[PDB]
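Re: your question from the hallway

Yes, I did run it. Sequences:
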Amino acid sequence: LAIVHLLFLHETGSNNPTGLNSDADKIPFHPYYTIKDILGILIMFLILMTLVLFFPDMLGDPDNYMPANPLNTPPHIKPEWYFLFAYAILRSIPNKLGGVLALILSILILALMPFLHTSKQRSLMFRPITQILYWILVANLLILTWIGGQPVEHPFIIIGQLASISYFSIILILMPISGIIEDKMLKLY
Amino acid sequence: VPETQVSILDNGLRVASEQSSHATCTVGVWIDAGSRYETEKNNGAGYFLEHLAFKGTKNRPGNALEKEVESIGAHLNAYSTREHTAYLIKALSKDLPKVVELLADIVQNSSLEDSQIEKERDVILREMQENDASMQNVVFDYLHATAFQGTPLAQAVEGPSENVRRLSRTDLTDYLNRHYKAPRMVLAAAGGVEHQQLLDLAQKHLSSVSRVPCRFTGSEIRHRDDALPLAHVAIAVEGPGWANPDNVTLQVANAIIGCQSFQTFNISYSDTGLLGAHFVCDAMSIDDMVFFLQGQWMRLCTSATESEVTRGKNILRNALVSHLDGTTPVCEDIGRSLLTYGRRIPLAEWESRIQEVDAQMLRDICSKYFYDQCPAVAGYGPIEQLPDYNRIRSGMFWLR
Ligand code: HEM
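Structure:
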């Protein structure tokens, strides 16, 4: 699927942070960007080996070092960190089914993302209001990651419920309206 | 082959001649003065003086100069490079008496009528407005700009339109009075001339002429204009020089190399130069050619063959200029030899320096000048597929 991912991209070429047509300024990759990917590989290996050789259990759970007991359930069950944002959403919706669906949508909302683009500019380099909304989205994604960790009790629950409401409202509603407003400010709309 | 006999006069002007049985003669004056001696405030002084030099001197006001040199039946000629300026006349030998007096006026006693100055300015300017049509010259005047950035060797012979418009008699007078010294001048004659008669004529006329860190930068200039049908690309490294002995082993290397219009050049200036290749190709193939070129340079550097060297020595052998080539070609060689080497190198010495070249010293000298060197690249036209500097620099060497 990653090979298919690379193919569906070369047909169009990569994007640039300005969001403009970069056909006037393109350079080779092997001599030019490879030393950049090699440097990024080296930095990622530095972070991976300082995660392995120095703090090998800062991201895992201690209760996984006990054998599986069906008769006892660890009181505090938390899915791993990167599933937390989803975990929060699931816990937030009162209805079980609702939670499952919202959870799925949490990931799927992204797929839905290319149909929500209502701006005449591709990138957010020249779009400050949608930049603010994007960083608020990153902020409450971090909040949902924290909440998942917290146990079920006040006021963690309410934050979770709001944070999920704010997440879906920023992705679904606030960004296209903000893009319309930004197009209106540049005398385009 | 008859020897070239050189004498020296009071002024310091040299009088070189190489008698031959051909009937006409090519008498010229060379001067060690070009765009390299200009200091960016008079960047077109030599070119504009080269335009003004045939428009009349005190002795020959108006069209007199052209008229007489026309009447005698002499095709006068002139040219300017980055280091040398030449004024030469091809004429029936018997006319030396006037072929020499006329040349004397052209170098001294010249008159730069301001009226004429105005017109020549327009001429130069307008032509320059169109000199852009000579793509090859453009490519070669940037292969110079980007290779000799910050030096007087980057600036063109014609100069920028700016200076052309902003030039005055006095400035010209200066360039004339500064870079036209007698010790930096050679009176060269080729063909049916006697050396003693030419020496007496130089003593009679022209005996009045007054007696008084270039660097290569591996770089790249890319002029992209996609509307042009063809692309011209020149890649060069630092040539040894004019006097450097290895020049000859480099000429043989060029004779080994010989997409499209893939010429090869060894341009030499005073202890510097540009050694490389210029090729014009459809945009889509620029990449291929650039690579092919490299592979070839590399072939010589590590894999020469006596056979091919021979092919190269022989072609070089048939390039040497001689009485057969004619008077002008020879004069021209006499003037450049006295200006650059200080002497006329005979063809026997050239043949000795050619026959001492073998394959081992050719690949040694080619590895000295081509292998792992930073080139200067100049492209003009649809040059998007022309590779950038890392790919060319990596093609300047082989892993194996
Ligand atoms: C399996 C994990 C993934 C891998 C290994 C992967 C790998 C890559 C690679 C190698 C590229 C080309 C290099 C680059 O653009 O930086 C790329 C581009 C891209 N990927 Fe992914 N990707 C993954 C997941 C995703 C996901 C989940 C998304 C959607 C959110 C995504 C969207 C994109 C986009 C849009 C580009 C083009 C970026 C651009 O040029 O603007 N990828 N991916």
